[PDB]
Design a protein around this nucleic acid. Structure first.
Ligand SMILES: [Cl-]
Ligand SMILES: [Cl-]
Ligand SMILES: [Mg+2]
Ligand SMILES: [Mg+2]
Ligand SMILES: [Mg+2]
Ligand SMILES: [Mg+2]
Ligand SMILES: [Mg+2]
Ligand SMILES: [Mg+2]
Lengths: 197, 171, 106, 134, 193, 188
RNA sequence: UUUGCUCCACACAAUAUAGAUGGAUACGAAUAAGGCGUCCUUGUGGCGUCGCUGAACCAUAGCAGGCUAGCAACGGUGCACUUGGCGGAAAGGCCUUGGGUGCUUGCUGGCGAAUUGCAAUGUCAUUUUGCGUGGGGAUAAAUCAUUUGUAUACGACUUAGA
RNA sequence: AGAACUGGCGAUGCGGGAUGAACCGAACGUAGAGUUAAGGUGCCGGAAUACACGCUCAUCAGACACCACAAAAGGUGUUAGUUCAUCUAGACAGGAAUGAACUA
RNA sequence: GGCCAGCAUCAGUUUUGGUGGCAGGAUAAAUCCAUAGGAAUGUAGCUUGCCUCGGUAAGUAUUAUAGCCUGUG
């Protein structure tokens, strides 16, 4: 519906989210993903760390700069899962990937916008309680991601500003609710109730 | 499929030497009457010197549950073939009809022992009339006085791709 | 008012196809707000237009149209099949189309 | 200084629990749990709303906060007597859950002329609300 | 089939590629970790290599055979005239790495530094930094704003310095300009220094 | 087999107050305060009265039920830790070389120093965890006493002292030199 | 190198669209738990209330939206200015003060529409760039050639020269 | 490597098995519409992130005939089952079920 | 009368909804009503011991101030 949909990546399964996002991009919807460092993957941390090291050992023998490129950042890990679900070698696939943006944290342009979630990909709604899972932020650090602390510091600063904004918004909402309640019990309110509004 | 219970009555073909042969009856669980008659000859050929070409079906009638809206404890005896050997087994199922219990039984055998339909013989299905004759704990735990339990971690269904709030699993 | 729309927004998904062969004579259309084959029965027979722009002006306009119609439903999720007088071009996979309310049975 | 343990408030699967059917022929109708078959199956019966006595999966219904006294395994006639005595229908109609259901149905039954009247009335109410806020 | 005899590999694979350096002045890719409980000081210096010679000294190492005995050693001499501070640069931490935010230059620059900005100095009009010096013509409000921005946002402070090439026997006449990180003290103290 | 219900009982004495919310357990008693985070078990706590607390698991398998009893023991150790405390006694065992143990201070870190183990020139140091106090009992030859409110902190700190004095490249059956836990008990 | 270069407002041409057609509508955290309101001794506190999806909320009437009269409120909102504060992760945005000005469908009036002929996107968006008006702003370098040897197969590199 | 009966490839495209002379489905004039076969419906990719009862957690899980491999022997991992004995006349461990030997 | 379209009434093929009347079976089985008998995961009442003056625990008691199961019509 919205011209741009911003998805908060916290608490989403990587594969389930990537499948949903890839289909949206091919259907013509622009998608922005934020907080890629809070993504989850099913299975314990050690098991997923072994999987990435299996990916690390794959490289072109005669020239390593030709072989598969191993990106360490959480946003790039999600991008790899997404690109594998798109025919990226075609012009149609290239156009779809140009309608997608992935960021660690919430950069300033999108920190004042509305974020949504994908219920089909949420860990708390999919995984059986008690099952082990890993966070993409700690997995990236163990394989050579250098900017975990910088993102954490910036996120803490953003949340302080966002909490102050919510305090003013909450107080304004209470004032609006009181005026609507007082404006009820009138003839206009009675007619609206009969029509469902 | 969805099982129905039939009574099937058969006999040997009449002869001048032996007019009016004996009538044999059995109860068969099947998804239709065509399968039910086929199963009747399968078990009859295991007990008497007779086959379909040498006999006839007298009557086939569907048997309905007497009290389909009453919860009953059923004891079931089965014989099945594993990958190496044949075994007998007793299990208990709690349902509201015999056909419902049998349908659960075939699902349970497939899930826990990988036994297909062809490898299972239903020996007997009988309702357990009294408490303390139930000998399986997974059934006995539902017979406690004033049984209550919650349903934690409710997962709701979403008809839209995107949601504008974090969902809750309260119940 | 600020809105003058009399059509329903739609998306051109792809041609009718198997795993490896496509059929350009039939296009698959996704209609917003439709998620059930029973709901998609309402839009059967409705006219569809694809509106696009060109640099050259031909008949006193720089806006061109390709006309079509809804023929039948497709799948379990509310997609419909549509045929056009001239087949839609493949570069419009993911482009917006307009589903009009006529011919009407209301 | 006393121990403080936060309490849970789950709706319990029990005899006398009122359930709302969301899938099947009896969707949107109330029913009462009569017997518990297993962890996932119960026996329901609603005579007031024309819900046949049947065994149902717990995934087909939603537990409601309402409950009433009912003997275990009670038949349809007894269920009707207890349902009427406990006044289940009027308690359900007073809840905000039922009112939102009724409000959603009414909003979908409006006509084009009635939708025009809603817009006009909303603007009149908005004028008073904005004046009061300022 | 396997090689007949085992030998270690020739050469080091960590010094690849064996290509020409991008510039004659080698980059400093790592500075000492800052300890902000110390006075502000430079972390590096610039000089020109002159040659080698020999010295004699007494060895002070217990347990050595040559303990308390003279040893002959080779040394290298580097000509190090004083450097001139002509600017400062501030950096901000970013999820994509350090980024330079602001650069503030000194009011006056000598011909040594200005030659570095030209390839045809003898033909030029020598207009470099002419309009930037006008930012000092007023009370310095423009310079104060940029310095305040460095104090507010920067997490790393470096200073721009150039050598005094005219004091060496070299004939280049064109000075070398480089960034040197400041360690010790707070960000405000680094900028004030 | 997905048992319907399993319950365990937790008793509290008169002087101990327990506050549980969102699987955060805080036990306050005469000897101090202990806290524990249990957001990995999926259990439910409820209060019967001021002297009894119940913990339950609903529709749990064999493995899930096995962790329910673990919760009871962990909470109980917190309750008796803030009431009676814990004391671990260790002895020094050596054949020829005496073992010298002393408390030393290094950059305000409160270490414990072990010297002359099997004649080694190396100095062995073990950090003392927070909340653990170390005393050398009198009238007992070669005894060190560790005390604290947290059983895990006391036990693990003593375990570090045992592991740091392991014999290498020798028959450990013959060379029985080390420091070993000899008694587990309470302060009271 | 025949008045070049740059910015601002609109004028006419050309250029193309991976695809506007009321509004991307901002806490955080937990999920075997929370949101909101309220009271106090401000807490891992008491009480009330909500969920069971955005099926919402906001907006939405007038020649794609005209010309005029009156009443009630002193509000709502658009445009160009103005006061102050905040925002550096890619800030390029957010909030606030004052006045001027247009509109108001909160309510009651009076005129106008046709013929596009029974439908034909029936043209109302934003990309880049060029040529002519006039209102301000600023008056350089690089390469070849020559030269150097900290460089070098050739390019390249590093130096010097009014 | 060599025979028997039949069906195929060779001489044959088409849908399916990613890929393949022989397997599965089905055999071909040029087109339109409808319905299917074998095989499939998270994304690549046309089609239910359908419904239902269970089982499985692997520091080398598993995932579909021909087909692109795994065995003997073991595990108080977990699940179901068979036989015998103890236990209301209080067993096992130090106030409710428990023990032993086996099956898959 | 050449090009491109719209609607109505029909014909051929086909796809997707709403609704009416009948037949069969244990002339469905249940529910419901009447009646006989019975039991417990035992309702009312009663007895027994401690109990923040009404709350449990187990004995009796087969419809009473809840109900249920089975046969028969
Ligand atoms: Cl090497
Ligand atoms: Cl050269
Ligand atoms: Mg690296
Ligand atoms: Mg280099
Ligand atoms: Mg051969
Ligand atoms: Mg040949
Ligand atoms: Mg294959
Ligand atoms: Mg698809």
């Amino acid at each position: 519906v919205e011209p741009v949909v911003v998805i908060d990546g916290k608490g989403h399964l990587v594969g389930r989210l990537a499948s949903v996002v890839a289909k949206q991009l091919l259907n013509g919807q622009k998608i922005v993903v934020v907080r890629a460092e809070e993504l989850n993957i099913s299975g314990e941390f050690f098991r997923n760390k072994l999987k990435y090291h299996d990916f690390l050992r794959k490289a072109t023998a005669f020239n390593k700069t030709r072989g598969p490129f191993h990106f360490r950042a959480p946003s790039r890990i999600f991008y790899k899962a997404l690109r594998g679900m798109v025919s990226h070698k075609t012009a149609r696939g290239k156009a779809a990937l140009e309608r997608l943006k992935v960021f660690e944290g919430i950069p300033p342009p999108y920190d004042k916008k509305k974020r949504v979630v994908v219920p089909q990909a949420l860990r708390v709604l999919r995984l059986k309680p008690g099952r082990k899972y890993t966070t993409l932020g700690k997995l990236s650090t163990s394989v050579g991601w250098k900017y975990e602390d910088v993102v954490a510091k910036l996120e803490a600063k953003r949340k302080v500003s966002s909490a102050e904004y919510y305090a003013k918004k909450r107080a304004f909402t209470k004032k609006v609710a009181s005026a609507n309640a007082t404006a009820a019990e009138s003839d206009v309110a009675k007619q609206l109730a009969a029509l469902g509004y | 499929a969805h099982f129905k219970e039939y009574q099937v009555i058969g006999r040997r073909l009449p002869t001048e030497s032996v007019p009016e042969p004996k009538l044999f009856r059995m109860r068969i669980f099947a998804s239709n009457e065509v399968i039910a008659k086929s199963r009747y000859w399968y078990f009859l050929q295991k007990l008497h010197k007779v086959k379909k070409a040498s006999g006839e079906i007298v009557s086939i009638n569907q048997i309905n549950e007497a009290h389909p809206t009453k919860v009953k404890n059923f004891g079931v005896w089965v014989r099945y073939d594993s990958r190496s050997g044949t075994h007998n087994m007793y299990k208990e199922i709690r349902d509201v009809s015999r056909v419902a219990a049998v349908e659960t039984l075939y699902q349970d055998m497939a899930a826990r022992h990988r036994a297909r339909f062809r490898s299972i013989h239903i020996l007997k299905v009988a309702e357990i009339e009294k408490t303390a004759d139930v000998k399986r704990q997974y059934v006995k735990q539902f017979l406690t006085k004033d049984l209550k339990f919650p349903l934690p971690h409710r997962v709701q269904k979403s008809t839209k791709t995107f949601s504008y709030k974090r969902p809750s699993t309260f119940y | 008012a600020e809105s003058h729309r009399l059509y329903v927004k739609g998306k051109h998904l792809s041609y009718q196809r198997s795993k490896r062969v496509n059929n350009p004579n039939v296009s698959l259309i996704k209609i917003e707000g439709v998620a059930t084959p029973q709901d998609a029965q309402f839009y059967l027979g409705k006219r569809i237009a694809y509106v696009y722009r060109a640099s050259k002006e031909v008949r006193g306009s720089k806006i061109r149209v390709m006309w079509g119609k809804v023929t039948r439903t497709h799948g379990n999720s509310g997609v419909v099949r549509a045929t056009f007088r001239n087949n839609l071009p493949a570069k419009t996979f993911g482009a917006s189309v307009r589903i009009f309310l006529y011919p009407s049975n209301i | 200084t006393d121990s403080i343990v936060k309490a849970s408030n789950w709706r319990l699967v029990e005899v006398g629990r009122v359930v709302l059917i969301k899938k099947g022929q009896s969707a949107g109708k109330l029913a009462a749990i009569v017997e518990i078959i297993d962890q996932k199956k119960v026996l329901i019966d609603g005579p007031k709303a024309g819900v046949p006595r049947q065994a149902i999966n717990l995934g087909q219904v939603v537990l409601t906060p309402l409950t009433f006294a009912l003997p275990r395994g009670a038949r349809t006639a007894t269920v009707s007597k207890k349902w009427a005595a406990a006044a289940v229908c009027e308690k359900w109609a007073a809840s905000s859950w039922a009112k939102k259901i009724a409000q959603r149905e009414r909003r979908a039954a409006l006509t084009d002329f009635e939708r025009f009247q809603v817009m006009v009335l909303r603007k009149q109410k908005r004028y008073t609300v904005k004046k009061a806020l300022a | 089939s396997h090689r007949k005899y085992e030998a270690p590999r020739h050469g080091h694979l960590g010094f690849l590629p064996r290509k020409r350096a991008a510039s004659i002045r080698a980059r400093v890719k790592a500075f000492p970790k800052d300890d902000r409980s110390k006075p502000v000081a430079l972390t590096s210096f610039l000089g020109y290599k002159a040659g080698m010679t020999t010295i004699v000294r007494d060895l002070d190492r217990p347990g050595s055979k040559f303990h308390k005995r003279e040893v002959v050693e080779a040394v290298t001499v580097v000509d190090t005239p004083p450097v001139v501070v002509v600017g400062v640069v501030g950096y901000v931490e970013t999820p994509r790495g350090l980024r330079s935010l602001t650069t503030v230059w000194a009011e006056h620059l000598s011909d040594e530094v200005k030659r570095r900005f030209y390839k045809n100095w003898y033909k030029s009009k020598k207009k470099a930094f002419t309009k930037y010096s006008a930012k000092y013509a007023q009370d310095g409000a423009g310079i104060e704003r940029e310095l305040a921005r460095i104090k507010k946002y920067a997490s790393v402070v470096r200073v721009l310095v150039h050598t005094q090439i005219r004091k060496t026997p070299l004939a280049q006449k064109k000075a070398h300009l480089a960034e040197i990180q400041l360690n010790g003290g707070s960000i405000s103290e680094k900028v004030d220094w | 087999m997905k048992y319907i219900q399993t319950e365990q009982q937790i008793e509290v004495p008169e002087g101990v107050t327990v506050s549980i919310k969102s699987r955060i357990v805080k036990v306050v008693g005469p000897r101090g305060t202990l806290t524990k985070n249990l957001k990995h078990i999926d259990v439910t706590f409820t209060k019967v009265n001021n002297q009894l607390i119940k913990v339950a698991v609903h529709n749990g398998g064999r493995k899930h039920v096995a962790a329910l009893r673990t919760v009871k023991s962990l909470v109980d150790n917190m309750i008796t830790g803030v009431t009676k405390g814990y004391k671990y006694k260790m002895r020094y065992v050596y054949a020829h070389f005496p073992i010298n143990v002393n408390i030393v201070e290094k950059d305000g870190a409160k270490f414990i120093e072990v010297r002359n183990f099997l004649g080694d020139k190396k100095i062995r140091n073990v950090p003392v965890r927070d909340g653990v106090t170390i005393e050398f009992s009198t009238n007992v030859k070669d005894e060190i006493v560790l005390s604290g409110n947290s059983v895990e902190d006391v036990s693990q700190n003593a375990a570090d002292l045992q592991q740091i004095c392991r014999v290498r490249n020798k028959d450990i059956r013959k060379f029985l030199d080390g420091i070993y836990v000899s008694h587990k008990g309470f302060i009271t």
